[PDB]
Design a binder for this molecule. Structure first.
Ligand SMILES: Cc1cc(N2CC[C@@](C#N)(C3CC3)C2=O)cc(NC(=O)Cc2ccccc2)n1
Ligand SMILES: Cc1cc(N2CC[C@@](C#N)(C3CC3)C2=O)cc(NC(=O)Cc2ccccc2)n1
Ligand code: PRO
Ligand code: PRO
Lengths: 487, 487
């Protein structure tokens, strides 16, 4: 009975995951499949990254707005997601006069009105962002945080007078996403360009951040930044009069990150005692647990712990003193380890008379004795050191998951050691499907598809030797590409 | 042509309103009726009040969460909004296996899972809040901000071990709503209790803040705080084991405020030059406009204005220097008056050599000469004074809209001078419909209904004389009640 996780992360990944997100109180399941309740501990992470991203995109002059949840068939025909689109058809027990659709993304909704806001070069750039939810009602297997039917995200859309400005903003955003994942979630990502078979519909190109879950060998797209060029401008007639009084199409970007980031964080840092949180996204940085070794007095210990609590709160470090008289210290240790609190301070009589206390890190369980008036400083530093540790332990694990190959015969082996492969590729779009269908075929060897897809063409390219040929088709290769199984 | 408003507020209210919200760039209309785009200037107000409310409800230990947008028929039967509920019935061109509903409110969605979170008195109180959007797909006439089919709001839900705690939280929330409207929107409200015909379905009682628009004589409900008692607990089986090991029902509250607050603010402070913003919800507190009286040099004036801009930004007062070479100073004055900026600073050559500048308040258009090194301080104070002025001018207008009456014969007259009436009332629910139907009948005398409804029973009650009888039914009266036309 007790608590904790009954599956080990390295042995039954999927069940370890569902156990962790339910018992850490991040998530509640719901009676519609693919929909989940975000309880306060998870919503707090989202609020944290929201504050960071809002502050960074105000420096780029992006402004927040809110657009409607619904779109008409009329405006949806200008883009001619068709099966992922949910249709509202009645109110109460009577039918609507015209059925309407719930947004899977806000391109058509927003660009239906862009033309009245953009008429001349004086109106550019236009830079909008929304924090909202979208609905993609697919019938594949959902995964909490990772792939859901309704999810929270941010979506930004910009319009510029030329291509250079737009592309610069695309890559500025992509580095903001790098920081979102590193400075707050302590998660390393790889920047790259999607192949033509995988880019956003209507984009000129799609840039992307990719993460990897090494325990089950799967890549996950972490965020995207599309250069749309003038494609949507042509569809929606977003013209402006330039400084030579010539009509031009705007050059557009759109970009998005979702609550999938939370999932990625859990899958990277979680362990067999459960959740591990980077301090910057944990509401409580410290939990103080008292220990009464049948002590002659509770109240010296109560007094001491609340002294430590006010030391910590005066310096704006939010913490909690678990003084519940009903539970034992061991119960409390596990209760807060499962909920991911980064630092635990224990005081017993032994520590009280040495004017000391025990500090325990949640990441490596290393315990340290520290004098009372030293605790604040040693807490601050150690919070910092926890982040770096999490990050670098994840960074190493990312680096050691990429096997460089030059022929298809090396590929299946690497996939079955739970790796991605970096391979020379001709980038012809037909080969994408072929590679998918062959890797799946040779996967006869755990609920998700064995196909390997192109994940991204890394921005950091290794040199392409002179006559190096494509690992799949034998044609002359153009670039190095990442392939792997994904979510 | 030019710009501005072609209708005066006191003569064609509804058209003045639509002109103001479109031309101040608060709102864009959409091709689905009753749905509106919140452009950045309006969304900024919402973000402001969001920050205030988040900080205040964290002091009450309310925690933010996110629940799904959809509910099943199954969970919707436990509450047996039926016509306001939109039904999703297909994805793409295929039908869903079971149709699902979009939330008009989250009671049934959240309380379907409350029972697994509340099992014992140790689990109470439970305090949740959501920032989200809801859909009420009615076929009455929509009004931007005021009554829409999709709107943004906050909804809080709490569960307590007894009635006293729950009721205390109800009225704590109601005073937070009072502060939201006063300290940020500079809008006075009246606190009261809804009559039994107007309270939330399933509530024990509904407390409410009401506002009044004196230019067209209409009350608007500004926010609500419901004491649900154990009604929803009985429906959803939210039981807990108390400290005497007896099974008890939780006592619940729910409470909400929407973007209707923005509308109320516009209707209170707007004038014939357009929008008037309280500084605390304006992104730009100050706009600096340069004036070149055919000056021998632009650049002394450019230098001076940017000096003033850095004085203002160093002290964290966000402002904008309108240096567009194309437009005249008069154009710029109207451009920023229409957009509601509270303070305008003008510099011409005359002012530059006196080392002075002109400060103009947006509320009363009063202009004042001020020395350069004095500007910061005189800006700060004047921002403050603008708020109080707006508030008290609105407060007076609220007070002078209530006529106290004792018989029905006085009522129609007061309604036609655009007043509310405070009347002695027996509070029998039947009379509600009767009073509605009679006032509408006698309204033959501008697109909205002439019926007068009970708005609220004020918390601030005048004394009820000994044998005072109900103004409608002649029965002995119980309390004083506000009645009027509403939105
Ligand atoms: C939670 C989450 C996230 C995301 N996506 C999309 C790509 C992206 C990135 N990068 C967004 C564009 C920015 C991302 O995170 C997508 C999703 N659901 C789905 O696709 C639908 C679905 C539902 C159930 C099963 C299978 C599929 N669910
Ligand atoms: C913008 C906004 C606000 C609010 N409501 C509700 C009461 C409340 C208060 N207090 C909320 C509970 C807190 C409020 O603000 C309600 C609405 N639409 C509607 O009723 C539906 C509708 C749509 C078109 C025409 C006529 C009616 N639209
Ligand atoms: O869904 C996507 O991938 C793009 C980026 C956000 C809006 N549309
Ligand atoms: O809609 C209402 O009036 C209540 C308060 C927020 C949730 N339900």
């Amino acid at each position: 009975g007790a608590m904790a996780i009954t599956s080990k992360k390295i042995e039954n990944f999927s069940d370890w995951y569902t156990q962790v997100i339910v018992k850490s109180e991040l998530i509640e399941y719901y009676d519609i499949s693919g929909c989940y309740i975000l309880r306060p501990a998870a919503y707090y992470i989202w609020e944290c990254v929201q504050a960071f991203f809002n502050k960074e995109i105000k420096k780029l002059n992006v402004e927040n707005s809110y657009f409607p949840l619904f779109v008409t068939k009329n405006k949806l025909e200008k883009e001619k997601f068709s099966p992922e689109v949910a249709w509202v058809t009645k109110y109460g027990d009577s039918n609507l006069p015209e059925e309407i659709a719930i947004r899977p993304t806000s391109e058509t909704i927003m660009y239906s009105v862009f033309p009245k806001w953009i008429r001349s070069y004086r109106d550019l750039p236009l830079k909008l962002n929304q924090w909202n939810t979208v609905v993609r009602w697919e019938f594949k297997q959902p995964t909490p945080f990772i792939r859901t039917r309704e999810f929270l995200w941010q979506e930004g859309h910009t319009a510029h007078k030329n291509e250079e400005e737009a592309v610069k903003l695309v890559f500025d955003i992509l580095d903001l996403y790098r920081r979102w994942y590193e400075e707050y979630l302590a998660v390393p990502i790889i920047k790259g360009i999607k192949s033509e078979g995988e880019k956003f519909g209507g984009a000129n190109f799609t840039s992307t951040a990719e993460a990897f879950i090494s325990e089950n060998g799967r890549a996950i797209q972490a965020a995207t930044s599309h250069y749309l060029g003038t494609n949507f401008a042509k569809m929606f007639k977003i013209e402006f009069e330039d400084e030579n009084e010539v009509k031009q199409y705007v050059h557009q970007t759109s970009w998005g990150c979702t609550t999938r980031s939370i999932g990625i964080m859990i899958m990277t840092h979680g362990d067999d005692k459960g959740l591990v949180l980077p301090p910057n996204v944990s509401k409580y940085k410290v939990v103080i647990v008292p220990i009464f070794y049948k002590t002659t007095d509770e109240n010296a210990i109560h007094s001491y712990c609340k002294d430590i609590e006010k030391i910590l709160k005066n310096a704006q470090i939010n913490c909690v003193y678990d003084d519940r008289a009903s539970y034992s210290p061991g119960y409390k240790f596990n209760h807060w380890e499962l909920r991911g609190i980064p630092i635990r301070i224990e005081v017993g009589p032994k520590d009280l008379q040495n004017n000391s206390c025990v500090i325990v890190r949640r990441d490596n369980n290393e315990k340290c004795n520290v004098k009372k008036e030293s605790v604040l400083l040693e807490t601050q530093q150690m919070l910092v050191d926890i982040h770096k540790n999490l990050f670098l332990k994840a960074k190493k694990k990312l680096d050691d998951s990429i096997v460089q190959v030059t022929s298809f015969s090396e590929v299946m082996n690497a996939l079955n050691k739970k790796k991605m492969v970096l391979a020379p590729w001709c980038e012809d779009i037909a080969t994408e499907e072929e590679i998918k269908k062959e890797t799946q075929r040779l996967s006869l060897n755990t609920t998700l598809s064995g196909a390997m897809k192109p994940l991204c063409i890394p921005l950091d390219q290794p040199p392409m030797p002179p006559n190096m040929k494509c690992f799949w088709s034998g044609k002359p290769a153009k670039r190095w590409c990442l392939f792997g199984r994904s979510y």
